[PDB]
Amino acid sequence: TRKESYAIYVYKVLKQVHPDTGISSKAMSIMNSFVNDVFERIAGEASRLAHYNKRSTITSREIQTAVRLLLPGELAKHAVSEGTKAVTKYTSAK
Amino acid sequence: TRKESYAIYVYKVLKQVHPDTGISSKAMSIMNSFVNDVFERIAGEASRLAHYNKRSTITSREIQTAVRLLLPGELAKHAVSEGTKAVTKYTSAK
Amino acid sequence: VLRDNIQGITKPAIRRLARRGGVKRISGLIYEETRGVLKVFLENVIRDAVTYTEHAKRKTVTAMDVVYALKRQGRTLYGFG
Amino acid sequence: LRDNIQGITKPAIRRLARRGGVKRISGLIYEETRGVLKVFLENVIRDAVTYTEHAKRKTVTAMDVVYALKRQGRTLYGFGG
Amino acid sequence: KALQKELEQFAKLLKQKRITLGYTQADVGLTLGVLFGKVFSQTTICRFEALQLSFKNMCKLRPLLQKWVEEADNNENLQEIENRVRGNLENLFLQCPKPTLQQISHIAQQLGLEKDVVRVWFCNRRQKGKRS
Amino acid sequence: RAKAKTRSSRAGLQFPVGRVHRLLRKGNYAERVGAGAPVYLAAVLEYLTAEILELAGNAARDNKKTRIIPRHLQLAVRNDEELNKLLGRVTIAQGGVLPNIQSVLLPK
Amino acid sequence: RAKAKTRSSRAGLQFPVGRVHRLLRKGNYAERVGAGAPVYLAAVLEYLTAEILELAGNAARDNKKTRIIPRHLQLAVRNDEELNKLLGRVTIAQGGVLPNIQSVLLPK
Amino acid sequence: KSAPATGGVKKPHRYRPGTVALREIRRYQKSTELLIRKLPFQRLVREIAQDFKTDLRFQSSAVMALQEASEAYLVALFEDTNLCAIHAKRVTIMPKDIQLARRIRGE
Amino acid sequence: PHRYRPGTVALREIRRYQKSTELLIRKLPFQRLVREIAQDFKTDLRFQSSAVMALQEASEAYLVALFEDTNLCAIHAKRVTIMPKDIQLARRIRGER
DNA sequence: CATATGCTAATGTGTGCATGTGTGTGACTATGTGCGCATGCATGTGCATGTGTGTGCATATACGTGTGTGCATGCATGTGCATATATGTGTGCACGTGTGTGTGCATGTGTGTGTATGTGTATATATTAACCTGTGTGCATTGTGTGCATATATTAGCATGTGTGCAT
DNA sequence: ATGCACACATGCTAATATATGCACACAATGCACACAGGTTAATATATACACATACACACACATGCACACACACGTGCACACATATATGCACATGCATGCACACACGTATATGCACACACATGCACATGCATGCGCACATAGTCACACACATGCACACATTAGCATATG
């Protein structure tokens, strides 16, 4: 059947940052592993944050707090900025 | 309000193993923390096991495999024996 | 609160901690080094605990915030909830 | 399959030490390294086989090994997880 | 400088203590030997008390005598308890001023003298002949 | 109807089977929870509690104490190989350390 | 209906917002997921991917390569302090190590 | 001059270096109480926290948990540091011992 | 006959193997070892080739990191040759004991 | 017998030459690097397609806001005394040096085992479809667990004896 | 072997932290009931294993030796120990605020379900970049030969101190 992965999105990002640079299949697998790992870490932290506060929904606030908990200083600041900007643009465009 | 803990059940277990031995409040708090920690570890491992195998139910099989993964050898064997015995008695009585 | 409270971790206290660790002889440069290490450790835990406190929209750091921060760092602590 | 630990030869252990930046190696290193690798492989393979049993399979997959490594705090990238 | 007069004063007082303690100069050398190990001959003590020795030697023997006079005052009882060879060697000179060790051994065996004694005497013969 | 009896008594356990089931259901672990899973988990938790409590009671008796304190729990955990492995990254408050002096530091 | 616009294009993102939302829903994290949570998470994942890919592309360009291989990802991660902290317990397959010889081992 | 010999011998005698250290090792490995004074540690915690949020409050049990964790961390680090010092055929722990222990631990 | 002094080609190999990324253990003996170890847990066990490759990658990464820590322990003791006690110390500090 | 002399064995201080050792500066030798040319497979582009996501209402409910309450935190005040600190001393530990040995490195050689290719078979993994049993939902019943008070046994604080180990 | 300092053992009081009890309320249980996830039987295919072959490179073994390490020794200074003084921690109260929690209402929002399309994935070539190989440049390593330094020994240059005999 169909095995979903992040390969096409990673390729789009790579073309955004390095239009003339390709990527090998093993490197693509490593990038897919990295995306899944970071997703699992952030989602687990946000789930625990919702549980600690007796909340049943995971919102962008929980994601922001999980990102701050899991990421080192400058990475956390820049990731929080990107997430906030994306959420603002999304709600501005419904 | 009411705060739930394992203190009374830990006390019953203590009275069975050591009928004439008490426990301090700090030691009871530590026992509560230990029970919660082991519960969270086992339940998280069982949840991951269910997700890996494309299942939506946590069954006693997932719990048994999580116990085998998380507990060291002899502890794991005795815990598996206790859990199997309890499930067998529960099914035979209901 | 105050300023420069790392000196409050005195040389005798560091010596007692080293004795509990089974250390027989301590060089004079250890204490300062120890202080730095402690500060780093605390800076990593408190920063996380406050983050938890900030998420709950509280102004008081609770024992549970510290416990969650310690668990987040792989240093789970029993006896405080 | 009997006594396959000696298949981890002296030159292979020396190459592994060179990648680790080691310049000089005592003659007793090789047996200790074989024991260390044997223990590591026991732990990982035991967890991977447990994952294989839970799936009711008879083939150890790459995902079983990846999950076993992740459970031990040794996350590996590049094999589907 | 004034070390000369300080040595002289010390030596006069040393003579006074030696005469007061009833010790002969040979006995002084014996005491120095049994308390330090470097026994000195009574000629050295004579030349000291008369201030005949050289300045470097003067300073060199100052400390030993200082220690002896500062220590012996406590208890005394336990502390108390050839020409033909010359002529032959001169005959051996006037022909070979600096003989080899091979000849030196023969000379030593001939006149019954120790090898080191003959060697040092040969060196001093050369020395006094090179004076002039 | 019939006189209600807890699932803990049905399973012959002291730990609360119903509470474990509720904690599994509301803990966001899976969409569904089987009937035998809370029983198995409660039995395992009770067994581990019993092991640690019996070792800690032995440690308290060795100290002529009738009440278990955090020191006894720490001694029981650290003196047991498998329990020490299970709680390797765990700090027990007011537990102290095992008495251990390296032989090189002992007097000659 | 109007023309169907993907939520990723609405949020200005390359990573799939809908897939992230579905994975959050079926991942057993909470019984409800907010509308902005998958958007925030997808944006964060895209940012981290972009950082790593930019560093790895620079590493590949340094080695006169047009294609990123695991070695370039390893060099990018380990040479960046923050990424190295984030991935400190992660092994990258076929990544090798960083060239490092202790100065005491060098000839004098 | 005067006379040699002379006493001056510092009669006062004491315990040998390391005997009291071993006694303190046994004493503090037997006990469980906190080895850092509570008030200075609380002041240090508040001063460190003031850099993250202004006008923070602390539960007493929060500071107690912080102190328990900090002392456990430091004692374990000192055990590792002692192992490193003994490895170098010494009995005195030095800052390089702490640095090596923290490097190996992954800190 | 030319002879390099001790430690020269050792440093050459350090540079060579820190420049490369290929597996350093032979694949077939490692596969035999993996199957031999897995026999003690099950009989008639089959392995995906990618599973054995993942095991080898993890094993070599673990051993290389251990050798780095062991080298640090050896240098700490003012030596340049790693010894079994260095490995034991590194594993004890790491908590792998 | 004990001092003063003349005199010369004996040692002691200094050059220094000559020899031996260690060092330093640049030919052979080996090895890693950098183009240059040719190949293969592996990456990237282009299509069917079917599955998952977007759209649209309709419903439920979780959470955010607002009010009121009581705990509990921070601050100030006061206390004795246990602890920290600065000082002086001496010891034994760390470090530096020197050395001898044997262990480990560099190298050469013969081989046998790993590697890559190729094949085929069976075993097992994955997929599909019917079904049925176990689990979620909802609601009434109520029995268990928790919070708030008592009552007490255990633990903590001293005072003398008791070995117990250290150090001269 | 004896003296001294320290941790422990028996014993007695005192309190505070634990064990037990009673009331209420909330979550566990019991009972239908619906439904979908999981089970099971059959089947199609993927792929792992087992064998077979040739080849060549890496491994194993033996050799020669260099330098790293373990041991020994000397030393100086850094740190342990003891002491006298003073600081500030611990305790203990008491007060006021402020903030964390409870509770309730009511809406914004997440879910649910059905449909429709377009996005992502499997499959298919196409080509071009990474790899492989032979040549040549190109960096570094290691004697080599020499040069400089340092020892020592040893020769030779001064001082030194004891003998035989002279005084006395």
Q: Walk me through the domains of chain F, giving residue ranges and CATH numbers.
A: 1-108 (1.10.20.10)
**G61 three-class SS:** helix
Of B80, C76, B49, D71, give the one whose Cα is nearest residue F48: B80
Give I26: exposed, middle or buried? Use CB within 10 Å, 0-12, 13-18, 19+.
middle
G34 touches strand K (CB under 7 A): yes
Q: CA of A82 to nearest chain C CA: how many angstroms apart?
A: 19
The reply to whether E25 sits in an annotated binding site is yes
Q: What residue ranges do the domains of chain B occupy?
A: 1-93
Rounded to a whole number of angstroms, the distance between the first and last alpha carbons of chain D is 30
- Please tell me the distance from the alpha carbon of residue A13 to that of residue A30, in angstroms, as a whole number: 15
Give strand letter and number of the nucleotide nearest H17 (CA to C1'): K80
Of G92, H55, G28, B7, give the one whose Cα is nearest residue I61: G92
Q: Which two tokens stand for residue B76?
A: 């794991």
Give F61: exposed, middle or buried? Use CB within 10 Å, 0-12, 13-18, 19+.
middle
Is there a contact between G30 and F29 if contact means CB atoms under 8 Å apart?
no
G26 touches strand K (CB under 7 A): no
**C78 three-class SS:** strand
Chains in touch with E (3+ beta-carbon pairs under 8 Å) read: H
Cα distances (angstroms) measured from residue F24 to each of C2, E70, F33: 46, 98, 7
- Please tell me the distance from the alpha carbon of residue H4 to that of residue F66, in angstroms, as a whole number: 69
Per the CB < 8 A criterion, the answer to whether C47 and H45 are in contact is: no
Angle between helices H60-87 and I49-76 (to 10 degrees): 80
Query: Residue B23 forms beta bridges with which residues?
Result: F68
User: What residues of chain F lie within 8 A of the CB of A51, using their CB?
Assistant: 27-28
What technique solved it? cryo-EM
Query: Residue C25 forms beta bridges with which residues?
Result: H92
The reply to whether E42 sits in an annotated binding site is no
Any idea which residue has 């991942």 for tokens? G27
Q: Is the CB of B65 inside 8 Å of chain D's CB atoms?
A: yes
Any idea which residue has 């190990």 for tokens? E37
Q: Which two tokens stand for residue E33?
A: 């030997």
DSSP F38-82: HHHHHHHHHHHHHHHHHHHHHHHHHTT-SEE-HHHHHHHHHHSHH
Q: Which two tokens stand for residue A63?
A: 């994601």
CATH class of A1-93: mainly alpha
- Please tell me the distance from the alpha carbon of residue A74 to that of residue E56, in angstroms, as a whole number: 80
Domains in chain H, please, with CATH?
Answer: 12-107 (1.10.20.10)
Which nucleotides of chain J does any protein CB come within 7 A of? 1-6, 8-11, 29-33, 42-44, 51-56, 62-64, 72-75, 83-85, 89-95, 103-108, 113-116, 123-128, 134-136, 141-147, 153-156, 166-168
- Please tell me the distance from the alpha carbon of residue H17 to that of residue G63, in angstroms, as a whole number: 59
Q: Which two tokens stand for residue C53?
A: 């406190």
Q: CA of C60 to nearest chain F CA: how many angstroms apart?
A: 22
Q: What is the CATH number of domain D1-79?
A: 1.10.20.10
Per the CB < 8 A criterion, the answer to whether G96 and G88 are in contact is: no
In I15-84, at which residue ranges do the beta strands (DSSP E only) sit? 46-47, 81-82
Locate the chain F residue with the closest alpha carbon to B19.
F57
Query: Residue I81 forms beta bridges with which residues?
Result: D24
Q: Is the CB of H12 inside 8 Å of chain E's CB atoms?
A: no
Q: Is the CB of D75 inside 8 Å of chain A's CB atoms?
A: yes
Per the CB < 8 A criterion, the answer to whether G50 and G29 are in contact is: no
| Candidates 3.20.20.80, 3.90.950.10, 1.10.20.10, 1.10.260.40; CATH matching C1-80 | 1.10.20.10
- Please tell me the distance from the alpha carbon of residue G104 to that of residue G94, in angstroms, as a whole number: 28
